[PDB]
Design a protein around this ligand. Structure first.
Ligand code: CU1
Ligand code: CU1
Ligand code: CU1
Ligand code: CU1
Ligand code: NA
Ligand code: NA
Ligand code: NA
Ligand code: NA
Ligand code: NA
Ligand code: NA
Ligand code: NA
Ligand code: NA
Lengths: 96, 96, 96, 96
């Protein structure tokens, strides 16, 4: 452990995220097949754009979830500044 | 076909890109395992940030390759405006 | 008022940010003069890229400042969740 | 000069872009007044988000204009690869 407060994921949450990552995994191998089949660079870039888009989506979702629940809990419990600093670090990371 | 001029990829080009997509595929399943193991949301977000970063890298590489070779060839061959319009569309796509 | 906790800016903080916005204001009018003088589109785009860069910089700075001080204070004072929700909204805004 | 082919801007084009940069200039000074009046950091960030948004808009517009007309002309005239390389440089610049 050795980290900020966390609300554990449900069977539901894990399942949903998982599909999104599977779909994304598929897209990634789809792109793999495209490169192997020597498909047009533009077609490939379109799919890459799709992937990046799907990643921002799942990433934002996890960000909001963590802030709305886990960080919110820490604020209630008294470890908010700890959790807030973590949160700011990943924000700057997504900016770097 | 029915698309702009393309310079076909070498055994070399395909191999290199492929590793990058494999590594990225790994990262994606790594993230999958992380979610399943109910790992900390922040740790997961860091890895997602890594993935998006690796995707921008391979995407930019493919973009430059296509422009430097394929689009450049079309300009020489006389189908440059065709290839240029395609290129502008994917740029706007990466912006949307 | 009617908003989350705020630590007021110093004479110092206001001065520093101000220079950065002035410089940015200059860049913006520089770009204005460039357009008027019918300068090359590429040169103009380079300067626009500069401006956007300078804006991300000052924006991130204000973001960190607000989180490190104002939001941190609210967490101590007991209005952290209020301040956290605000913070998440502007994050999503910078993403939209 | 010493640059790729350029189609000069009309009285119209200059006028339109100009308004957009003026509005943006206003926003920038609006933000200046906000900082001076010691307004809430969140309110300021919202306006900064607005500005960055308006800059992407005018920037993309100039990008498309340059590609659709100036770079397209160079391709017809025989200096397309020259103009294409310039265009790729500013793309990478907006990515750096
Ligand atoms: Cu969390
Ligand atoms: Cu290509
Ligand atoms: Cu603040
Ligand atoms: Cu131009
Ligand atoms: Na905590
Ligand atoms: Na403290
Ligand atoms: Na072509
Ligand atoms: Na034409
Ligand atoms: Na507050
Ligand atoms: Na609460
Ligand atoms: Na030219
Ligand atoms: Na050539």
């Amino acid at each position: 452990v050795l980290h900020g407060t966390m609300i554990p994921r449900t069977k539901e949450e894990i399942e949903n995220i998982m599909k999104r990552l599977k779909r994304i995994e598929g897209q990634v191998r789809g792109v793999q097949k495209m490169v192997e089949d020597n498909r047009y660079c533009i077609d490939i870039l379109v799919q890459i754009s799709a992937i990046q888009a799907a990643l921002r989506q799942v990433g934002m979702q996890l960000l909001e979830r963590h802030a709305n629940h886990c960080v919110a809990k820490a604020i209630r419990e008294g470890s908010g500044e700890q959790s807030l600093r973590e949160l700011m670090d990943v924000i700057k990371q997504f900016a770097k």
